[PDB]
Amino acid sequence: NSKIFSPFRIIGNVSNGVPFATGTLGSTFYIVTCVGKTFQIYDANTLHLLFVSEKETPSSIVALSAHFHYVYAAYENKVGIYKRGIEEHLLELETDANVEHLCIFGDYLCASTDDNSIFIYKKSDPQDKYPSEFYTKLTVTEIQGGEIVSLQHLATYLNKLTVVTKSNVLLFNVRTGKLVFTSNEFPDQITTAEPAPVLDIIALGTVTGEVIMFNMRKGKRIRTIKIPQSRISSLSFRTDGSSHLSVGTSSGDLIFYDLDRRSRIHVLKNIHRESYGGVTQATFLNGQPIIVTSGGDNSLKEYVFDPQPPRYLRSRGGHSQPPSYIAFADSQSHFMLSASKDRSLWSFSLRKDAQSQEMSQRSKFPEIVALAIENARIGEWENIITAHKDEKFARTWDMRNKRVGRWTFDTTDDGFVKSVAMSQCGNFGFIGSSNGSITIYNMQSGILRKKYKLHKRAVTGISLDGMNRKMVSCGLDGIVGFYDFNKSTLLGKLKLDAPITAMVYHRSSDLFALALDDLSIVVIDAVTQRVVRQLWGHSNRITAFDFSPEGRWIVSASLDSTIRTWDLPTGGCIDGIIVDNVATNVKFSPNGDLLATTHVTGNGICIWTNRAQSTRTIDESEFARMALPSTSVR
């Protein structure tokens, strides 16, 4: 519908809080996470991205299970059966209820719904790849038990499904339909269940921090371990020889307990954010001393036990909150630098492996409010500058070692840093203060080189031409400053009619654009120091903007929930897109091929293909109402 941009894919998505599944991969295992309406499959021993489901489900995936080489994904009243990210079959349950839980075992598929029904599907022939024929519908009436919490199959329990509810534990024979067992009432609410590696035993977690070892055959407790003032969210048994139990909690802690020594081994504190559900799943890999953990904070971590407290091994993740600032890190379209209000700085790969890595800050730094990066001096010295909220100094980072750098750059006028910039050569860093000063630092030695004082209000933008001749600045005072870099002379001043909130400088054309509080975009020629164009159209605050690499276009985003393309030779809007999720950032790839956008909701970065590498006709309400790119692509 848009004439310029077509949705490509989304970067930086790992997990959303749905408990991940584990399956078999030849000799190794695979991990299935949820991203929303898409699942992703990783190798368990490398965390390499193996698959992503090729086609989005109509609604959000609620449950994931893996059985051999098949993934079962529940959404609405449906269960999708996938192999290699490709849907091989779709089960539509005869109900308007939603599927909540899944259990696949023997010739059976069991899917419980939110009205306490359990739909049972069966293989026609045992050598079928998956169950497909509806067999029966069980129901747990409120007298038989409480709300269904989990469906489990215990080892050697032929044709027998264990249905754990909030108040009790039931045993159904799914072949005959008979309820063969129902335990005594449990006093405290059951929240979690997990088959033990020995006969007849299932582990049950409660709302109170109790893990109960329950014997299904005799129908009695065998053991009850108390975890003080914790709410259990996951259980898993180690199975490599050591009789250990892991207990995840909603507060984000992972507790390791020795079943034989009856003592608390250890506790990994706050490995996942509590506000996102804490530990939503934690699983020991079968036969291995490795535990895989996840939460709703978009991370997937792996912990090992060396032949001793567990040691961090590897992990994959992205931001837990929407990205606040982004930038292309290089001209080969390899990495993107991305900052979020979760106080993290990440580098995301744009390539197929979807690799990513958080910038080491070696309790986090305050949230980033401005960002600049240049690839010129990578490996040689610091090449990233960040401004942080309410801090009077900018920090530096090293893109080579993915770690914070040596220098901090003070404003010198007791103001906060409100803008940062870098020379193309990578030799200089620029810092703009809330008190008006502009400071120029040496990226190699960290030394203060030069100081300018023109603005009397916050400097909201700074840049320097590719030849380091003329430096330009903007501020909330509505002033545009022009300075000689080699000396320190004020080359000129412009007074604009509204406060200026941001600047983007186009080095190959020496034009720079400014976002003003009057909702216009002002384009200025740095050589002539004159306004050459003014763009009017947006009906709300401008969030971001960028030049197309050639210099012909400017693309802008706004609170009005639009993304507009402006042709500079005419100053007219030649394309407009209406999104349902306001764009907070827009950046062109160094080469004109891609457009990166960040939005109010969503942890990732949207990639768009510029399919116009066009008419000059004006538009109005002919804007396209486009959706964001699919998480199922690539």
Author numbering: 20 to 326, 338 to 392, 409 to 659, 664 to 684
Give the published text.
As part of an effort to understand the structure of UTPB, we have determined the crystal structure of the tandem WD domain of Utp21, the first structure of a UTPB component. The crystal contains one molecule of Utp21, but no Utp18 molecule, in the asymmetric unit. Residues 1–19, 327–337, 393–408 and 660–663 of Utp21 were not modeled due to missing electron density. The tandem WD domains of Utp21 fold into two 7-blade β-propellers, resembling an open clamshell. Blades 1–7 form the N-terminal WD1 domain, and blades 8–14 form the C-terminal WD2 domain. The two β-propellers of Utp21 are more open with an angle of ∼150° compared to those in Aip1 that have an angle of ∼110°. In addition to the core β-propeller domains, Utp21 possesses an extra loop (residues 657–684) following the last strand, 14C. The loop wraps around the side of blades 13 and 14 and inserts into the inter-domain space, making contacts with blade 1. We have found several highly conserved patches on the bottom face of each of the Utp21 WD domains that are potential binding sites for other molecules. In summary, structural mapping of the crosslinking data places the WD domains of Utp1 and Utp18 on two opposite sides of the Utp21 tandem WD domains.
During transcription of pre-rRNA, the formation of a large knob can be observed by electron microscopy at the 5′ pre-18S portion of the nascent pre-rRNAs. This particle, known as the 90S pre-ribosome or the small subunit (SSU) processome, is responsible for early processing of the 18S rRNA at sites A0, A1 and A2. UTPB is a large complex composed of six proteins Utp1/Pwp2, Utp6, Utp12/Dip2, Utp13, Utp18 and Utp21. Utp1, Utp12, Utp13 and Utp21 all contain two WD domains (WD1 and WD2) followed by 170–260 C-terminal residues that contain no recognizable domain (hereafter called the C-terminal domain, CTD). Utp21 occupies a central position in the UTPB complex as it interacts with all of the other proteins except Utp13.
